[PDB]
Amino acid sequence: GVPTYGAIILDETLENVLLVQGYLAKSGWGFPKGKVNKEEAPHDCAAREVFEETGFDIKDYICKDDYIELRINDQLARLYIIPGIPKDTKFNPKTRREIRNIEWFSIEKLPCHRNDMTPKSKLGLAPNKFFMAIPFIRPLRDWLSRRFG
């Protein structure tokens, strides 16, 4: 796939993260991110996608070596970690045609896996509105413990 770049924005307490909710196939909650354009650098793509989806500009805050990157089904998604953004920041997407809503969520309350259906003796996973965020949650928590104690 084309790589995607974006951000994990945290508040001043490091307790909350900013998620966005899209439409249709993207109808659940996920970190702001999107596909890189031809010849666009990773940090520029992350700032662009984040400003398109949240109206907040991360460019002055990106730290080149501070990110979580996952390869999911042969596509790479890298999210730059952006701590310390106040909880009272006004966030507004570019177009409501793409983003339904933008909210802070408690990190300790977010799931880091979907639940099975072993109660129903059925294979697979139960739906979860955080499905797009979930893969990053445990790596984030581990990253925060390592890089803040």
Instruction: State the CATH superfamily name.
Output: Nucleoside Triphosphate Pyrophosphohydrolase
Q: How are the strands ordered across the major sheet? A: 4-1-6-5
- Main sheet characteristics: 4 strands, mixed
Helix content percent band: 10-25%
Approximate strand percentage = 25-35%
Distance between the termini: 35 Å
Number of strands: 9
Secondary-structure element string = EEEEHEEEEEH
Radius of gyration: 15 Å
According to CATH, the fold-level topology is Nucleoside Triphosphate Pyrophosphohydrolase
CATH-level-2 architecture: Alpha-Beta Complex
Number of helices: 2
Q: What's the overall geometry? A: globular
CATH class descriptor: Alpha Beta
Total tally of structural domains: 1
Structural class: alpha+beta
PDB class: hydrolase
Keywords: mRNA decapping, hydrolase, Nudix
Assembly: monomeric
Entry title: Human m7GpppN-mRNA Hydrolase (DCP2, NUDT20) Catalytic Domain
